[PDB]
Amino acid sequence: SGFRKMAFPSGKVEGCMVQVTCGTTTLNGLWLDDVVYCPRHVICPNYEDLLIRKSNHNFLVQAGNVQLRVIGHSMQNCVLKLKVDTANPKTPKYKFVRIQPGQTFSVLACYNGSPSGVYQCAMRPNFTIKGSFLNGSCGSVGFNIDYDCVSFCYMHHMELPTGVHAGTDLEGNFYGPFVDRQTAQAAGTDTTITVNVLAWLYAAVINGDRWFLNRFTTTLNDFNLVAMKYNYEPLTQDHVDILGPLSAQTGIAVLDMCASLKELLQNGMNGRTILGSALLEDEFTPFDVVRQCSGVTF
Amino acid sequence: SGFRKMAFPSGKVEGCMVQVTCGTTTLNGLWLDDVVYCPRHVICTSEDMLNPNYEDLLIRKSNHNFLVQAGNVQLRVIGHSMQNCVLKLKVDTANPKTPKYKFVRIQPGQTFSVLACYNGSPSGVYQCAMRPNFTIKGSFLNGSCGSVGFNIDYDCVSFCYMHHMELPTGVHAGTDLEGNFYGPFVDRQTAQAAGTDTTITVNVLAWLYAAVINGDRWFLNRFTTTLNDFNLVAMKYNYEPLTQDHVDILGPLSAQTGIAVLDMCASLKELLQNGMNGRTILGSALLEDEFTPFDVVRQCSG
Ligand SMILES: C[C@@]1(C(=O)Nc2cncc3ccccc23)CNc2ccc(Cl)cc21
Ligand SMILES: [Cl-]
Ligand SMILES: [Cl-]
């Protein structure tokens, strides 16, 4: 029993964290094979012009107490790729994957190439992450683990004025309408990840919390009209299908659970809690709930 | 900016997780140097569990009865001993991934990261606190026994917990790495119940200071309180008494935010009386008590 916000074991990613220093700026880099990936703003804008003025010896890469020698540099979108002479012997089986909003991933927060913490979070529908980052965290990465393969999905670039965070996939493409420059940028109005709230309601049922269940069912049309009204993301047939296993395990159809969520939105919790929370949690995907309530290992 | 429930990077602990099998029971072990630590109940059947005599059951075991697996390699047990509720299996290979480590026993309110494992394989990492009733509110399934709680301050892993059991309420009980249980619990299937849980007051105040540091000030008020008046009010909401030790510990956060401890205590009294009124503090509609004063400073400063 128990339901916790749980991150993937960070070991395979810790072996890849290095410190990248260029001029006065120090941030984190991801060392995979003979390449170190990091935010291109470490060179700080006309990034092609600024990068052409840099030489390999301008970038100081440190892996533990060992300095790696940079033998090449290139830019792919907002990520800088520093070719090094030594392949990381701790390189795990990995992929670069771009995730969708509502998808969750673990963040290994680093400072000076050293991992300091690990937390689980979701790519908000407004493409920001509500992370926890101090100055020097840039280059910290977000990932998932699929069997024994680390899928790198995020690299931290900046903090928006509201305290939320923005970054790119490992190909340097930003999540959201953000740019890597000091300019007026604002996160759009956020919405709730509906499929994730339903997955979390199924996790609560699996854990014995049933007070919110009701005799009612609804249609995807009637539910989405209510979802739009309460700044909840539309629930697609894809989402209903993904919730299928949890629906079969708990005996509560997805539209039956949707009627529970509909009542929770129109009436509130009434002093009650679900899994120790007075708010509806939306940072557990249907796959996270299955993984945690069945015991998948890495 | 931002405030998250954050666990320590689990890498140093992952390299120590192994699978321990004795008879029909399979659970997790912690492999440090040439010793594998695991709950001693691995030597029990479900029949032995009501009133087990562990000295008697262990004397009947031989080294070849314990099968230890580190990845796809079987380790050879060359000795076995029991220290309180932990079984120590001496092995013929020192773990090359052994980090710098310590065994530390923590007090209620202290937080730690848990690396949840099944069959010697890490499946997840989360943040916990030792509840005042000495249980932990974990996320554990059958087979998680032997999963450990730790803190990684600097480059040394301080092992503070090993999971042993789930109480009837879904809360969890375990021991330090010396086999001493936290709480009035025993490693038997006898009727055991967690005492009434209370909110960790010093941790809630630390979390209110974290919210002030992050720009949330709505809950602040012009009032102060005596320590005794605060405790008379807090006790009524099932909150732990706040000691002078706790007030002293909150000192640095009080200096950083400019809000005296007894002044923040008056905000807490008001929050307990009024509730949140549709508002949230650091994205939470409840008062969070699983961040210590040390966690807040580490997260909000480095
Ligand atoms: C092995 C056992 C135990 O609590 N296992 C579990 C431990 N953690 C989570 C679980 C969830 C679901 C079922 C079991 C779980 C069984 N009864 C008992 C009694 C005493 C001791 Cl010291 C250990 C145990
Ligand atoms: Cl004992
Ligand atoms: Cl302690």
XYZ file of C-alpha atoms and ligand atoms in Angstrom:
626
model
C 0.000 0.000 0.000
C 0.851 3.665 -0.269
C 1.097 6.060 -3.138
C 4.019 8.382 -3.493
C 5.345 10.749 -6.116
C 8.151 8.509 -7.234
C 10.990 9.204 -9.627
C 12.982 6.621 -11.632
C 16.238 5.461 -9.946
C 18.749 8.174 -11.079
C 21.930 6.039 -11.121
C 22.237 5.601 -14.906
C 21.922 9.406 -15.324
C 24.301 10.352 -12.439
C 27.163 8.620 -14.320
C 26.599 11.095 -17.199
C 26.587 14.407 -15.267
C 29.586 16.679 -15.867
C 30.348 20.383 -15.230
C 30.711 22.687 -18.264
C 32.437 26.048 -17.859
C 32.778 28.645 -20.614
C 34.081 32.010 -19.528
C 32.285 33.081 -16.362
C 29.294 30.689 -16.841
C 29.270 27.255 -15.187
C 26.397 24.805 -15.764
C 25.773 21.047 -16.245
C 26.402 18.804 -19.219
C 25.227 15.351 -20.183
C 28.185 13.115 -21.192
C 27.047 10.257 -23.492
C 29.683 8.318 -25.513
C 32.212 11.046 -26.671
C 29.730 13.973 -26.626
C 28.779 16.412 -23.867
C 25.370 18.056 -24.382
C 24.539 21.329 -22.586
C 22.395 24.527 -23.093
C 23.954 26.706 -25.802
C 23.485 29.809 -23.576
C 26.722 28.654 -21.754
C 28.565 30.548 -24.599
C 26.615 33.763 -23.575
C 22.192 36.700 -29.049
C 23.452 35.417 -32.404
C 24.586 31.983 -31.267
C 26.183 31.016 -34.642
C 28.310 34.204 -34.422
C 29.205 33.695 -30.728
C 30.057 29.998 -31.235
C 32.287 30.648 -34.283
C 34.483 32.862 -31.982
C 34.949 30.020 -29.456
C 37.734 27.479 -29.516
C 37.816 23.959 -28.027
C 40.055 25.050 -25.141
C 37.499 27.775 -24.129
C 35.149 25.008 -22.879
C 36.351 23.386 -19.627
C 34.564 20.075 -19.026
C 34.966 18.360 -15.682
C 33.813 14.787 -14.967
C 34.419 14.366 -11.239
C 38.004 15.441 -10.531
C 39.057 14.717 -14.150
C 39.135 17.363 -16.857
C 37.895 16.124 -20.248
C 39.505 17.620 -23.365
C 37.109 19.136 -25.911
C 38.135 18.165 -29.474
C 35.137 19.686 -31.339
C 31.962 21.735 -30.902
C 28.709 22.074 -32.778
C 25.217 23.406 -32.132
C 21.925 21.615 -32.671
C 19.062 24.044 -32.072
C 19.384 25.350 -28.423
C 21.811 22.566 -27.335
C 25.588 22.759 -27.622
C 27.432 19.496 -28.387
C 31.002 19.332 -27.143
C 32.940 16.505 -28.719
C 35.409 15.058 -26.176
C 38.409 12.676 -26.563
C 37.097 10.134 -24.029
C 33.901 8.110 -24.335
C 31.966 7.965 -21.029
C 32.494 4.437 -19.722
C 29.316 4.798 -17.628
C 27.184 5.503 -20.772
C 23.923 3.584 -20.338
C 21.663 2.310 -23.153
C 19.898 5.589 -24.105
C 17.535 7.365 -26.526
C 16.568 10.985 -27.066
C 12.777 11.224 -26.950
C 10.537 14.259 -27.157
C 7.554 13.965 -24.789
C 4.011 15.372 -25.005
C 2.302 17.593 -22.370
C 0.848 15.501 -19.584
C 3.733 13.031 -19.857
C 5.804 12.651 -16.690
C 9.549 12.265 -16.229
C 12.188 12.365 -13.479
C 14.542 15.317 -13.115
C 18.047 14.932 -11.737
C 18.819 18.445 -10.418
C 22.586 19.201 -10.574
C 24.944 22.041 -9.615
C 28.536 22.106 -10.867
C 28.122 18.701 -12.543
C 27.100 17.041 -9.269
C 23.625 15.509 -8.733
C 21.914 16.993 -5.689
C 18.331 15.734 -5.953
C 15.792 13.771 -7.951
C 12.121 14.596 -8.385
C 9.216 13.521 -10.538
C 7.226 16.032 -12.557
C 4.993 16.560 -15.577
C 5.348 18.564 -18.752
C 2.452 20.953 -18.128
C -0.063 21.571 -20.972
C 1.468 25.130 -21.190
C 4.877 23.355 -21.800
C 6.510 24.499 -18.596
C 7.571 22.244 -15.728
C 6.865 23.267 -12.120
C 10.368 22.294 -11.061
C 12.752 23.221 -8.290
C 15.827 24.895 -9.671
C 18.410 27.364 -8.347
C 21.079 29.280 -10.372
C 23.573 26.749 -11.795
C 20.954 24.029 -12.410
C 20.917 24.705 -16.244
C 21.786 21.517 -18.092
C 20.025 19.304 -15.459
C 18.088 16.605 -17.354
C 14.696 14.961 -17.321
C 14.388 11.285 -18.176
C 12.355 8.067 -18.032
C 13.582 4.476 -17.929
C 12.070 1.876 -20.270
C 13.338 -1.558 -19.195
C 17.159 -0.825 -19.121
C 17.135 2.159 -21.570
C 17.246 5.746 -20.352
C 15.050 8.003 -22.500
C 16.339 11.575 -22.154
C 13.424 13.913 -22.676
C 14.417 17.253 -21.136
C 17.282 19.616 -20.456
C 16.761 22.650 -18.227
C 17.447 26.086 -19.765
C 15.639 28.790 -17.757
C 13.212 30.014 -15.107
C 10.220 32.108 -16.169
C 9.094 35.138 -14.057
C 6.401 33.043 -12.324
C 8.945 30.564 -10.900
C 8.050 27.865 -13.487
C 10.726 26.333 -15.718
C 11.375 25.988 -19.426
C 13.721 23.786 -21.395
C 14.311 21.689 -24.492
C 14.411 18.040 -25.618
C 17.983 16.617 -26.074
C 17.831 17.781 -29.737
C 17.679 21.447 -28.496
C 14.049 22.041 -29.451
C 12.245 23.993 -26.743
C 9.075 22.675 -25.198
C 6.652 25.591 -25.612
C 6.821 28.998 -27.247
C 10.027 29.906 -25.438
C 13.387 31.225 -26.595
C 16.784 31.094 -24.807
C 17.289 34.818 -24.417
C 16.752 37.342 -21.601
C 13.475 38.867 -22.866
C 9.810 39.230 -21.769
C 8.473 35.632 -21.785
C 5.419 34.348 -19.985
C 3.955 30.915 -19.496
C 0.492 30.575 -20.991
C -2.550 29.853 -18.791
C -2.087 26.285 -17.565
C -4.704 23.554 -17.576
C -5.128 20.287 -15.573
C -3.987 17.001 -17.124
C -7.348 15.183 -17.073
C -6.130 11.674 -17.993
C -3.558 11.929 -15.178
C -6.183 12.983 -12.584
C -8.305 9.955 -13.606
C -5.229 7.669 -13.331
C -4.628 9.104 -9.825
C -8.306 8.525 -8.885
C -7.793 4.848 -9.966
C -4.638 4.700 -7.791
C -6.719 5.938 -4.830
C -9.350 3.223 -5.479
C -6.565 0.593 -5.619
C -5.370 1.944 -2.247
C -8.846 1.690 -0.645
C -9.965 5.363 -0.896
C -13.516 5.046 -2.473
C -15.603 7.898 -1.003
C -15.653 9.798 -4.332
C -17.143 6.918 -6.312
C -20.743 7.297 -7.407
C -23.386 5.314 -9.280
C -23.219 7.624 -12.288
C -21.703 7.433 -15.680
C -21.322 10.146 -18.343
C -20.464 10.586 -22.049
C -17.085 11.789 -23.366
C -19.039 14.748 -24.888
C -20.807 15.761 -21.571
C -17.598 15.253 -19.617
C -15.417 17.322 -22.020
C -17.939 20.197 -21.812
C -17.445 20.161 -18.004
C -13.647 19.716 -18.414
C -13.425 22.814 -20.665
C -15.372 24.869 -18.095
C -12.917 23.983 -15.297
C -9.647 24.462 -17.287
C -9.149 20.725 -17.646
C -7.571 19.238 -20.771
C -9.990 17.433 -23.130
C -10.140 13.673 -22.589
C -9.751 11.816 -25.890
C -10.756 8.238 -26.821
C -6.952 7.579 -26.677
C -6.991 8.512 -22.969
C -10.052 6.336 -22.299
C -8.274 3.389 -23.997
C -5.066 4.020 -21.996
C -7.107 3.941 -18.743
C -8.530 0.526 -19.828
C -6.310 -1.685 -17.628
C -7.022 0.415 -14.485
C -10.742 0.377 -15.370
C -10.618 -3.450 -15.636
C -8.629 -3.813 -12.357
C -10.965 -1.602 -10.303
C -14.260 -2.452 -12.046
C -14.932 1.269 -12.579
C -15.443 2.268 -16.251
C -13.518 5.432 -17.391
C -16.796 7.376 -17.926
C -17.984 6.114 -14.490
C -14.721 7.593 -12.996
C -15.319 10.698 -15.197
C -18.710 11.200 -13.450
C -16.804 11.077 -10.103
C -14.349 13.714 -11.429
C -17.231 15.818 -12.763
C -18.843 15.838 -9.273
C -15.465 16.587 -7.628
C -15.088 19.640 -9.900
C -18.632 20.984 -9.395
C -18.759 20.279 -5.625
C -15.168 20.029 -4.294
C -13.713 17.630 -1.729
C -15.898 18.802 1.231
C -13.088 18.658 3.764
C -12.133 15.166 2.587
C -8.825 14.031 1.039
C -7.826 11.536 -1.683
C -4.440 9.822 -1.148
C -3.637 12.457 1.511
C -4.269 15.343 -0.903
C -6.999 18.049 -0.762
C -6.340 18.818 -4.491
C -6.735 16.530 -7.505
C -3.214 15.341 -8.439
C -2.358 15.450 -12.170
C 1.346 14.483 -12.231
C 0.885 10.664 -12.342
C 0.214 9.207 -15.764
C -1.817 6.022 -16.275
C 1.510 4.198 -16.847
C 3.038 5.630 -13.603
C 0.015 4.343 -11.633
C 0.312 0.831 -13.174
C 4.122 0.760 -12.646
C 3.755 1.793 -8.942
C 0.702 -0.377 -8.146
C 2.261 -3.525 -9.789
C 6.036 -3.198 -8.970
C 8.024 -2.787 -12.260
C 11.860 -2.669 -11.683
C 14.931 -1.043 -13.406
C 12.641 29.140 -7.365
C 10.080 26.355 -6.935
C 9.603 23.875 -4.139
C 9.429 20.177 -4.719
C 9.494 17.055 -2.602
C 12.947 16.016 -3.641
C 14.756 12.724 -3.056
C 18.555 12.272 -3.013
C 20.070 10.836 -6.224
C 19.768 7.052 -5.689
C 22.846 5.924 -7.684
C 25.117 5.211 -4.713
C 22.381 3.022 -3.165
C 21.393 1.214 -6.434
C 24.903 -0.258 -6.644
C 24.276 -1.940 -3.251
C 20.879 -3.580 -3.929
C 20.920 -7.390 -4.142
C 18.269 -10.137 -3.972
C 18.274 -12.450 -0.917
C 16.432 -15.770 -1.101
C 16.051 -18.209 1.783
C 13.672 -21.068 1.147
C 10.479 -19.740 -0.419
C 11.050 -16.091 0.731
C 12.743 -13.578 -1.594
C 13.478 -9.992 -0.478
C 16.155 -7.267 -0.854
C 19.564 -6.959 0.749
C 22.027 -4.116 1.108
C 25.527 -5.178 -0.049
C 28.249 -3.015 1.585
C 31.899 -4.221 1.500
C 31.656 -8.058 2.113
C 28.350 -7.971 4.073
C 24.743 -8.196 2.884
C 22.223 -6.753 5.355
C 18.557 -7.799 5.144
C 15.472 -8.240 7.443
C 15.950 -11.349 9.596
C 12.334 -12.419 8.801
C 13.762 -13.800 5.464
C 14.480 -16.981 7.537
C 10.766 -17.404 8.435
C 7.930 -19.210 6.785
C 4.429 -17.518 6.983
C 3.761 -20.196 9.755
C 6.868 -19.129 11.822
C 5.809 -15.451 11.665
C 3.342 -15.451 14.647
C 5.928 -16.265 17.333
C 9.316 -16.828 15.715
C 12.417 -17.668 17.741
C 14.987 -16.207 15.374
C 18.043 -17.472 17.320
C 16.596 -21.018 17.051
C 15.652 -20.665 13.342
C 19.027 -19.108 12.404
C 21.066 -21.810 14.200
C 19.370 -24.387 11.854
C 20.449 -22.490 8.717
C 23.643 -23.025 6.790
C 25.503 -20.617 4.450
C 24.302 -22.500 1.358
C 20.631 -21.994 2.410
C 20.939 -18.232 1.622
C 21.079 -17.459 -2.124
C 22.346 -13.925 -2.784
C 22.103 -12.491 -6.280
C 23.821 -9.251 -7.368
C 22.608 -8.671 -10.901
C 23.120 -11.896 -12.847
C 25.907 -13.029 -10.476
C 25.338 -15.285 -7.477
C 27.371 -14.261 -4.415
C 28.684 -16.959 -2.068
C 27.626 -16.666 1.578
C 30.598 -17.540 3.823
C 29.038 -16.574 7.199
C 25.843 -15.356 8.854
C 25.034 -13.508 12.034
C 22.091 -11.590 13.447
C 22.189 -8.120 14.940
C 18.788 -7.340 16.443
C 16.172 -7.626 13.568
C 18.771 -7.498 10.762
C 20.510 -10.527 9.295
C 24.129 -10.036 8.183
C 25.284 -12.370 5.442
C 29.035 -12.405 5.077
C 29.943 -12.876 1.395
C 33.221 -13.803 -0.402
C 33.250 -10.677 -2.610
C 33.401 -7.054 -1.482
C 30.951 -4.838 -3.417
C 33.115 -2.750 -5.748
C 30.335 -0.150 -5.940
C 30.387 0.343 -2.100
C 30.065 4.061 -1.489
C 31.344 6.044 1.522
C 28.625 5.170 4.072
C 27.423 5.411 7.692
C 24.612 3.810 9.650
C 22.598 6.573 11.337
C 19.477 6.186 13.506
C 17.084 9.114 12.907
C 14.465 10.793 15.150
C 10.742 11.368 14.242
C 10.274 14.234 11.828
C 13.496 13.453 10.009
C 13.210 12.902 6.284
C 14.981 10.434 4.031
C 14.814 9.029 0.511
C 13.580 5.491 -0.054
C 14.841 3.340 -2.898
C 11.950 0.876 -3.396
C 13.219 -2.518 -4.722
C 11.750 -5.874 -5.773
C 13.975 -8.914 -6.326
C 17.121 -6.845 -5.722
C 16.216 -4.365 -8.501
C 15.477 -0.661 -7.842
C 12.076 0.361 -9.183
C 11.606 3.862 -7.750
C 12.825 6.585 -5.450
C 10.695 8.757 -3.184
C 10.893 11.059 -0.192
C 9.687 10.024 3.248
C 9.629 11.216 6.808
C 9.758 9.199 9.996
C 6.303 9.940 11.461
C 6.024 10.900 15.160
C 4.305 7.479 15.691
C 7.546 5.882 14.224
C 5.933 4.573 11.079
C 6.680 5.790 7.562
C 3.965 6.383 4.990
C 5.687 4.586 2.131
C 4.632 2.982 -1.121
C 5.536 -0.640 -0.729
C 4.251 -3.869 -2.254
C 5.022 -7.484 -1.197
C 8.683 -8.182 -1.930
C 9.853 -4.651 -1.014
C 11.271 -5.866 2.359
C 14.891 -4.881 2.657
C 14.380 -1.634 0.614
C 16.349 1.135 2.371
C 15.920 4.744 3.444
C 18.916 7.065 3.233
C 20.278 10.612 3.083
C 23.227 11.593 0.868
C 24.660 14.579 2.521
C 27.933 15.488 0.731
C 29.512 12.214 -0.742
C 28.558 9.897 2.172
C 25.389 7.829 2.173
C 23.787 7.700 5.614
C 21.599 4.577 5.786
C 18.810 5.240 8.248
C 16.089 2.723 7.459
C 15.384 -0.774 6.215
C 11.822 -1.764 5.415
C 10.488 -4.792 7.329
C 6.649 -4.606 7.404
C 3.303 -3.118 6.560
C 0.888 -2.399 9.405
C -2.913 -2.946 8.949
C -3.453 0.753 8.144
C -1.142 0.634 5.097
C 1.698 2.428 6.957
C 5.148 0.876 7.205
C 7.508 -0.122 9.951
C 11.185 -0.921 9.855
C 14.532 -0.694 11.594
C 17.792 1.276 11.462
C 20.723 -0.602 9.795
C 21.640 -2.004 13.266
C 18.303 -3.935 13.306
C 16.657 -1.780 15.976
C 13.039 -1.086 15.096
C 11.733 2.439 14.990
C 8.706 2.391 17.304
C 7.091 -0.241 19.505
C 7.054 -2.761 16.671
C 8.228 -6.330 16.457
C 8.999 -8.479 13.435
C 6.056 -10.878 14.140
C 2.590 -11.294 12.588
C 1.017 -10.483 16.010
C -1.608 -7.698 16.320
C 0.253 -4.420 16.009
C -1.155 -0.971 15.525
C 0.434 2.350 14.786
C -0.252 4.957 17.464
C -2.336 8.049 16.555
C -0.327 10.058 14.019
C 0.466 13.728 14.607
C 1.637 16.519 12.335
C 5.353 17.387 12.516
C 4.991 21.002 13.635
C 8.639 22.081 13.151
C 8.480 20.743 9.571
C 5.256 22.645 8.776
C 6.910 25.874 10.052
C 10.022 25.139 7.927
C 7.677 24.674 4.917
C 5.859 27.978 5.712
C 9.336 29.657 5.682
C 10.043 27.967 2.277
C 6.779 29.484 0.975
C 7.792 32.963 2.223
C 11.206 32.562 0.536
C 9.339 31.627 -2.671
C 7.113 34.765 -2.512
C 3.991 33.350 -0.860
C 2.997 35.683 1.982
C -0.804 35.535 2.148
C -0.888 33.492 5.407
C 1.356 35.927 7.339
C -0.303 37.972 10.101
C 0.587 40.775 12.579
C 0.429 38.377 15.536
C 2.953 36.637 17.670
C 2.396 33.947 20.342
C 4.093 32.556 23.400
C 5.533 29.083 22.837
C 3.082 27.668 25.403
C -0.022 29.259 23.827
C 1.094 27.882 20.457
C 1.445 24.386 21.907
C -1.960 24.570 23.645
C -3.587 25.442 20.253
C -1.450 23.047 18.090
C -2.057 20.040 20.416
C -5.810 20.413 19.624
C -5.193 19.940 15.899
C -3.099 16.773 16.553
C 0.130 18.697 16.026
C 3.358 17.745 17.768
C 4.498 20.097 20.555
C 7.101 22.600 19.396
C 10.116 22.595 21.715
C 12.739 25.320 22.315
C 15.039 22.998 20.246
C 12.680 23.427 17.269
C 12.496 27.210 17.735
C 16.321 27.341 17.761
C 16.528 25.148 14.640
C 14.161 27.537 12.799
C 16.514 30.455 13.690
C 18.346 30.669 10.306
C 15.051 30.673 8.319
C 13.681 33.293 10.741
C 16.783 35.466 10.087
C 16.601 34.959 6.280
C 12.892 35.884 5.974
C 12.719 38.442 8.796
C 9.787 36.613 10.433
C 10.380 35.544 14.070
C 9.621 31.918 14.918
C 6.818 32.801 17.325
C 5.445 35.180 14.661
C 5.334 32.309 12.080
C 3.744 30.191 14.873
C 0.919 32.749 14.990
C 0.463 32.330 11.178
C 0.255 28.551 11.751
C -2.378 28.982 14.508
C -4.467 31.095 12.120
C -4.125 28.593 9.271
C -5.275 25.792 11.623
C -8.298 27.864 12.711
C -9.342 29.163 9.250
C -8.171 26.603 6.783
C -6.860 27.760 3.399
C -10.035 29.356 1.948
C -9.482 27.978 -1.548
C -5.856 29.180 -1.509
C -2.732 27.007 -1.761
C 0.723 27.315 -0.222
C 3.489 26.099 -2.545
C 0.848 24.342 -4.697
C -0.600 22.441 -1.727
C -4.075 22.773 -0.139
C -2.759 21.015 3.040
C 0.088 22.028 5.364
C 3.131 19.951 4.323
C 5.106 18.331 7.168
C 7.686 16.187 5.326
C 10.315 18.946 4.793
C 12.637 19.508 7.713
C 14.256 22.886 8.488
C 17.513 21.387 7.002
C 15.698 20.258 3.764
C 14.244 23.778 3.274
C 17.634 25.482 3.613
C 19.313 22.898 1.314
C 16.661 23.326 -1.381
C 16.268 27.130 -1.161
C 20.038 27.890 -0.941
C 22.111 24.926 -2.137
C 6.409 -9.869 5.045
C 5.323 -9.145 5.866
C 5.028 -7.713 5.341
O 4.545 -6.865 6.078
N 5.290 -7.474 4.035
C 5.039 -6.277 3.328
C 5.853 -5.143 3.388
N 5.601 -3.979 2.773
C 4.492 -3.895 2.053
C 3.562 -4.952 1.896
C 2.362 -4.825 1.152
C 1.492 -5.876 1.049
C 1.766 -7.084 1.674
C 2.912 -7.247 2.404
C 3.846 -6.187 2.544
C 4.030 -9.989 5.945
N 3.533 -9.766 7.295
C 4.612 -9.415 8.102
C 4.672 -9.385 9.492
C 5.852 -8.986 10.098
C 6.946 -8.651 9.312
Cl 8.377 -8.018 10.079
C 6.905 -8.715 7.931
C 5.710 -9.074 7.322
Cl 15.094 -7.793 19.205
Cl 17.552 12.718 13.123
